[PDB]
Coordinates of C-alpha atoms (C1' of nucleotides) in Angstrom, one line a residue:
Chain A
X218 CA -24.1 4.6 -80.1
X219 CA -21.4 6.5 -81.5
X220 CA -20.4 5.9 -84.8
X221 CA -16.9 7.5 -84.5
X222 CA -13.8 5.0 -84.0
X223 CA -10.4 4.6 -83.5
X224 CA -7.8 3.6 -85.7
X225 CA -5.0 0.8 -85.4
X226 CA -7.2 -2.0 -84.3
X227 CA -8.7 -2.4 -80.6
X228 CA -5.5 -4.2 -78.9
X229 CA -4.4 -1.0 -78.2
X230 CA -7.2 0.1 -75.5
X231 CA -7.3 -2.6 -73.4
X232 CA -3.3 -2.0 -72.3
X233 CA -3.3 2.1 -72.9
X234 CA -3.4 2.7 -69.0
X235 CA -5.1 6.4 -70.2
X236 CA -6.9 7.4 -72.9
X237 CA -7.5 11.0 -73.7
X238 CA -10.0 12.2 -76.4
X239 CA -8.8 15.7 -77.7
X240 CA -11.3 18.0 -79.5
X241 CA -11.5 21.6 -80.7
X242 CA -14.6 23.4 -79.4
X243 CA -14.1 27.1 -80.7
X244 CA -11.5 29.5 -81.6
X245 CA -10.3 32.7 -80.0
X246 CA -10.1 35.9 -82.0
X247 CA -8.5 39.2 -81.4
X248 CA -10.8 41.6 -83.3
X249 CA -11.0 39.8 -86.2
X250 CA -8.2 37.4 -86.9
X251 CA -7.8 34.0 -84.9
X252 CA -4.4 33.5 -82.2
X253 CA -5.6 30.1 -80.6
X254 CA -8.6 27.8 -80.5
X255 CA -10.7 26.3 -77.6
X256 CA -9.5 22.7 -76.9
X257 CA -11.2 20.2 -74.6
X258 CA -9.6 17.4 -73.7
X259 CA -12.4 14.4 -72.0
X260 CA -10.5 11.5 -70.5
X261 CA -12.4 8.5 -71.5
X262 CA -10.2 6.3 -69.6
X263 CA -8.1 5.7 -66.9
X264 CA -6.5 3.2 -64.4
X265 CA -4.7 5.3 -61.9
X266 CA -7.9 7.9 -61.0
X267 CA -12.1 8.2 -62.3
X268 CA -12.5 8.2 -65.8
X269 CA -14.4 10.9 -67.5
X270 CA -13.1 14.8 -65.7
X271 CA -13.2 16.0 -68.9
X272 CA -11.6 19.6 -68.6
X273 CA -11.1 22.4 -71.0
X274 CA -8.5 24.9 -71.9
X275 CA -7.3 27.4 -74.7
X276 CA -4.0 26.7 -76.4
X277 CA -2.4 29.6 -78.3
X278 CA -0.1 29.1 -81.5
X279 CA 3.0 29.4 -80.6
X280 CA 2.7 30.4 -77.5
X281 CA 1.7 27.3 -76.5
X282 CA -0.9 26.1 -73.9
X283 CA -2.2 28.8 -71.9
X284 CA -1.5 28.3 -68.3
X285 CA -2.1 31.5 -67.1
X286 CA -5.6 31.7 -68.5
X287 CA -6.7 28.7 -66.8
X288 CA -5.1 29.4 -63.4
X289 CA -7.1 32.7 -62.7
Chain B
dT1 C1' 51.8 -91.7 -68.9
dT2 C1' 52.2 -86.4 -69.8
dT3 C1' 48.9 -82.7 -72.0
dT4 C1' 45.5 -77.6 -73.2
dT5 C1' 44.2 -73.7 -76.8
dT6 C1' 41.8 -69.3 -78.8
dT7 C1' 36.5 -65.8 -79.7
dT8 C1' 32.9 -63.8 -82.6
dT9 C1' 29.3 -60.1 -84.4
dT10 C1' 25.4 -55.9 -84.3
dT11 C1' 19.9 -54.5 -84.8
dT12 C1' 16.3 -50.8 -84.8
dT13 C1' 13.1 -45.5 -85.0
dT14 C1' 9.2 -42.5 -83.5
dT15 C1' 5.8 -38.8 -83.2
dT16 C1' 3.4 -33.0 -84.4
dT17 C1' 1.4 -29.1 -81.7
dT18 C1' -1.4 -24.3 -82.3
dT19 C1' -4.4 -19.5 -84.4
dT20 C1' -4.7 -14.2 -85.5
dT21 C1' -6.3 -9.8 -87.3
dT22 C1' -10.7 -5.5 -88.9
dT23 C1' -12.5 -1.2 -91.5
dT24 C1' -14.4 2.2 -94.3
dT25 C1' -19.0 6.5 -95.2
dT26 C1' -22.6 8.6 -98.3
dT27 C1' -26.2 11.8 -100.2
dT28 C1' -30.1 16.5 -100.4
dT29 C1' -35.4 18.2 -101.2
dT30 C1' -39.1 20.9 -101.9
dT31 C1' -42.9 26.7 -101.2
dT32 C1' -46.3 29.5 -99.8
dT33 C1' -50.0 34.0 -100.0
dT34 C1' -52.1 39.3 -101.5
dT35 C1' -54.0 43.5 -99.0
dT36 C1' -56.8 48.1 -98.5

DNA sequence: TTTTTTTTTTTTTTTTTTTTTTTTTTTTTTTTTTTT
């Protein structure tokens, strides 16, 4: 299976109506120096729609998320 | 024959019903082969 687990005891996924599993794939680079990193969030639960549309984006530092990169 | 008159005091306990929680990695090992 997969070895990696939680923290805070299991009572917490059975009423967590969504559960989102957050993880840094690469990192974006101007040239040489880094501004953001590659984030892809995979929704490993859910009880208001299907479980498991994982879906990516890039979120810069300070900027924040980046919207507009995802919406073209 | 007539002719009623006045209450007094507490004694005793009886029985338990129910579980609720995980949490943490740890470690490298060993070369092979001259070619003209």
């Amino acid at each position: 299976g997969n070895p990696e687990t939680t923290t805070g005891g299991n009572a917490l996924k059975f009423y967590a109506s969504v559960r989102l599993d957050i993880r840094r794939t690469g990192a974006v680079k101007e040239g040489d120096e880094v501004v953001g990193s590659e984030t892809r969030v995979k929704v490993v639960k859910n009880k208001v729609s299907p479980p498991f549309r994982q879906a990516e984006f890039q979120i810069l530092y300070g900027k924040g998320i980046y919207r507009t990169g995802e919406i073209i």
